[PDB]
Design a protein around this ligand. Sequence first.
Ligand SMILES: Nc1nc2c(ncn2[C@@H]2O[C@H](COP(=O)(O)OP(=O)(O)NP(=O)(O)O)[C@@H](O)[C@H]2O)c(=O)[nH]1
Ligand SMILES: [Mg+2]
Length: 154
Amino acid sequence: MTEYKLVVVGAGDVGKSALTIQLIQNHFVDEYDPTIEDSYRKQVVIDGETCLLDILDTYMRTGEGFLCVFAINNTKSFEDIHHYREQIKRVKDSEDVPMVLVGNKCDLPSRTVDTKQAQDLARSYGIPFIETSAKTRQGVDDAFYTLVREIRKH
Ligand SMILES: Nc1nc2c(ncn2[C@@H]2O[C@H](COP(=O)(O)OP(=O)(O)NP(=O)(O)O)[C@@H](O)[C@H]2O)c(=O)[nH]1
Ligand SMILES: [Mg+2]
């Protein structure tokens, strides 16, 4: 079937790796042990088109579409997403590159990125915003299938 090369980007401990795992083994890890594989893959169905997801946990010119991740519990990571999109679309000679902004760590009650704040950042960058929590799985599948449609409708 069709295969889609997604890479997860973002700042430190935002939960890039942690997002992946939950997507692949439907489980929430509390600490990765310094990089093992970094490049998993999963068979899924999206609207009948069953297809494969090659997730690269962070060369990435290969990437087809990108999830940009910031944790909502610290605003530095959320400021750094400009630096990422600006670099995603750098090594890609196109301001058009399938992309999803995801805010992680929703069970955390001391949030410091307003849900509006992302929401507006997203629309200004043209992309969609999803909120996730690898610990409670909420919208972890959601944020990935979104990216896959942003690649197919591209
Ligand atoms: N409460 C909560 N903690 C989360 C959530 N997602 C990730 N974390 C935690 O945040 C920490 C960072 O996870 P990790 O996947 O290593 O983040 P990372 O982006 O891979 N960090 P690094 O850039 O060092 O590889 C982990 O210990 C994980 O338990 C979430 O939704 N809720
Ligand atoms: Mg990681």
